[PDB]
Amino acid sequence: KPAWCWYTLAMCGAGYDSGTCDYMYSHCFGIKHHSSGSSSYHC
Ligand SMILES: *[C@@H]1O[C@H](CO)[C@@H](O)[C@H](O)[C@H]1NC(C)=O
Numbered sequence: 001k002p003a004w005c006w007y008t009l010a011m012c013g014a015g016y017d018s019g020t021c022d023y024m025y026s027h028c029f030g031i032k033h034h035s036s037g038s039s040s041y042h043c
Pocket residue numbers: 011012013014015016017018019020021
C-alpha cells in the first residue's frame with residue numbers, strides 16, 4: 001500500500017508550520033472543515 005501521508009511527516013521531524021506537512025498532514029486527517037459546507041447547520 002502507498003505511503004505519502006506519514007512519509008510527508010517523517011521528513012518533517014517536529015514542525016508545526018512549514019509547507020508539505022502542514023498541508024498534507026492536515027488534509028491527511030481533516031475534520032469536515034473543507035471549502036464546501038458544514039454538516040447540517042441552519043435547516
Ligand atoms: C518545515 O519544518 C521546519 C520549518 O521551520 C524546517 O526544519 C523544515 O526544513 C521545514 N521543511 C520540511 C520539509 O520539514
